[PDB]
Amino acid sequence: DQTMFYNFGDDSIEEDVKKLMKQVYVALEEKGYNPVNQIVGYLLSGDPAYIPRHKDARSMIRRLERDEIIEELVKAYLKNNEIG
Amino acid sequence: DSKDQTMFYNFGDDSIEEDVKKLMKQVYVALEEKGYNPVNQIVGYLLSGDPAYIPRHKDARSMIRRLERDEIIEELVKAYLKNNEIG
C-alpha cells in the first residue's frame, strides 16, 4: 500500500535477474533446449555447461552468484503466491 | 473444510505445485514470526540440502524430506517465467 522511495540502483538485483532470465530463456529456446530443464540443472549443480554459449548466455549467467538468481526466484514466488 | 479417507496408508494427494506452495508458506510464516529473513534460509537450503537451515515447525522437515530440490527449483523457475510472461 505505502509509496516506496526509489534510490538509483535500488531494484538492481531484481532487474538484473529479470534481464538475465529473459535472455537466457531466449538462448535456450533458440538452440532447442527445454529452458526450465537447463536452468534447474544449472542452479542445482552450478555447472555453467548446462547453459548455451549462444547470445553469451553462459558468460552472462556466470557473472551473477547462483544465490542471487535463487533469491529472486524465491522472492518472486512468495510475492506472486500472496505469501508475506 | 479439507479431510482425508483413512482407508489405506496415504503418502500424500498434493501435486508438487501444491507441496511447494505449502512448504514455502509454512517456512516463511515460521521465520517471519521470529524476525528472520525467510528468503535467505530458503536459498541456503536450496544450495545445500541441509535441513538445519529450516526450523522444526509443523511438518516443514517432513515436506523437505518428501520434495527433491530439483522439483522445488523447477516450480520456482516455472512460476518466475509465467509471472514475468517469459515464453
Numbering used by the authors:
A (entry chain A): 5 to 88
B (entry chain B): 2 to 88
Please give me the paper's original passages concerning this structure.
Purified ReoM yielded crystals that diffracted to a maximum resolution of 1.6 Å. Other than IreB, there are no structural homologues of ReoM with functional significance in the PDB. The helical bundles in both ReoM and IreB associate into homodimers with α-helices two and four from each protomer forming the majority of the homodimer interface, and these residues are highlighted in Figure 6B. In agreement with the IreB structural analysis, 1200 Å2 of surface area is buried in the ReoM dimer interface, representing 9% of the total solvent accessible surface area. Other than the compact helical bundle of ReoM, there is a ~ 16 residue-long N-terminal tail, with B-factors 25% higher than the rest of the protein, prior to the start of α-helix one at residue Ile17. Consequently, it is possible to visualise Thr7, the target for phosphorylation by PrkA, in the flexible N-terminal region in both chains. The side chain of Thr7 in both chains makes no intramolecular interactions and is thus amenable to phosphorylation by PrkA. Alternatively, the presence of a sulphate ion (a component of the crystallisation reagent) adjacent to the sidechain of Thr7 could mimic what P-ReoM might look like. The sulphate ion is captured by a positively-charged micro-environment from a symmetry-equivalent molecule. ReoM could thus react to phosphorylation by a substantial movement of Thr7 to interact with this positively-charged surface, which comprises arginines with levels of conservation (Arg57 [57% conserved], Arg62 [99%], Arg66 [76%], Arg70 [98%]) amongst all 2909 ReoM homologues present at NCBI approaching that of Thr7 (96%).
Homologues of the 90-residue ReoM protein are found across the entire Firmicute phylum, and include IreB, a substrate of the protein serine/threonine kinase IreK and its cognate phosphatase IreP from Enterococcus faecalis, whereas ReoY homologues are present only in the Bacilli. Therefore, ReoM, ReoY and MurZ likely affect the ClpCP-dependent degradation of MurA. PrkA phosphorylates ReoM on Thr7 and PrpC reverses this reaction in vitro; ReoM phosphorylation at Thr7 in vivo has also been observed by phosphoproteomics. Our data are consistent with a model in which PrkA-phosphorylated ReoM no longer activates ClpCP, which leads to MurA stabilisation and the activation of PG biosynthesis.
